[PDB]
UniProtKB/Swiss-Prot annotation, chain A:
It comes from Shewanella oneidensis (strain ATCC 700550 / JCM 31522 / CIP 106686 / LMG 19005 / NCIMB 14063 / MR-1). This is Protein ApaG. It comes from the Bacteria. PROSITE patterns: APAG. Residues 1-121 form the ApaG domain. One of its GO terms (biological process) is error-free translesion synthesis. Pfam families: DUF525 (PF04379).
Amino acid sequence: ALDNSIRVEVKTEYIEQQSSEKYLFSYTITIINLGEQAAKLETRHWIITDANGKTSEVQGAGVVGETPTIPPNTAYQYTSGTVLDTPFGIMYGTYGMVSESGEHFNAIIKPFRLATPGLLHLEHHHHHH
Amino acid sequence: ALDNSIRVEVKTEYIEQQSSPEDEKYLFSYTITIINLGEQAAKLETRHWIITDANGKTSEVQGAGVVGETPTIPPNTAYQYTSGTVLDTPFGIMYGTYGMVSESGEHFNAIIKPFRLATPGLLHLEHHHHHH
Ligand SMILES: C[As](C)(=O)[O-]
């Protein structure tokens, strides 16, 4: 029931540039419950930040319109997206969970990158001879 | 000439609400199918969208290709792709054109008929029944 009983994994994908400039990204999240009892995702709380420092927040019921119940040792996956004003940004937040025993807690979704394949930062190394 | 060689079909889906305390936002996805019924390959070079919210407030999107590519659709082939858009109202309309170019080098447009974007059950269901 305690925190850490829920692990959040994330993958993203730059979808398309909407020049009017805006950038559409998609993100697929897998919420895995490794706790003793089942847990229900009741709310979400996103904090999005673009390359310019402009930040926005989204608080709502469930994810993609659903409040799934994730039994123990089960993984719930879903996909959504966000439109940024810049070709890259950072996104993090929390999910409002509720244990089978009626105990409410937050599942943490660590910061993750939103970026076009051309602006994804790469550190460069090489062989020393 | 080749204006009839391409047919566009589309389906949509309400993904998720992206609203902030005072700024309504609704994320939609759309899956376009571009069928080349021509006897020659056709390459999608540009797109030009006209997006309208429930109040007539429109936005215009113009760019090269779709989702990062300018696909070549050979004869008798249906190319599908998915993208999306965010509206400030739970209902809206989209329409526009794709700038196509044929193997022969000729440029023409593939029309994209207007289609809706709507959150499910925005309008209550109407009921019919076998009379008598
Ligand atoms: C599934 As999407 C992020 O292209 O609306």
